Amino acid sequence: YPTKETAHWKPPPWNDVDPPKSNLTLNFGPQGVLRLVMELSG
């Protein structure tokens, strides 16, 4: 029985799975000398 309150409720997924909706970037700068841009995954 949809009312005005329950007028935006969509049904759940058929497999009950909702979509989940990155990795670290470190700039080891000059602070010899060298700059490094790391893309780390942990």
Partner: protein
């Protein structure tokens, strides 16, 4: 009472040295600084592995909490039961360690 005096003296000396370290160079009038990190502005990435080693610490620390009355427990007159349950608690800590091992829970912080 002597312990409360000692804790208060240690806390008072620590707070005194912290106040001195935070307000002795404030008397200097050096300059006002403007000054406009490896990560640029990125959000702190969660790592599951640090949380796993922290929970593994907590669980083995609860097993340690069970193990702590053993020097008093050895004084009992039910020594066969005491020895069986002592070896059983250390064995269950070992089995928790082995299950954490063999299911790759101790990996990349091994």
């Amino acid at each position: 009472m002597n312990l409360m005096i000692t804790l208060l003296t240690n806390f008072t000396l620590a707070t005194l040295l912290v106040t001195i370290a935070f307000w002795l160079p404030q008397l200097n009038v050096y300059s006002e600084k403007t000054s406009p990190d490896p990560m640029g502005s990125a959000r702190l990435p969660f790592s599951m592995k640090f949380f796993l080693v922290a929970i593994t610490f907590l669980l083995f620390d609860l097993e340690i909490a069970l193990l702590l009355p053993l020097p008093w427990a050895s004084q009992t007159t039910n020594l066969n039961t005491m020895l069986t349950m002592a070896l059983l608690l250390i064995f269950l800590l070992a089995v928790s360690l082995a299950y954490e091992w063999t299911q790759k829970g101790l990996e990349w912080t091994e």
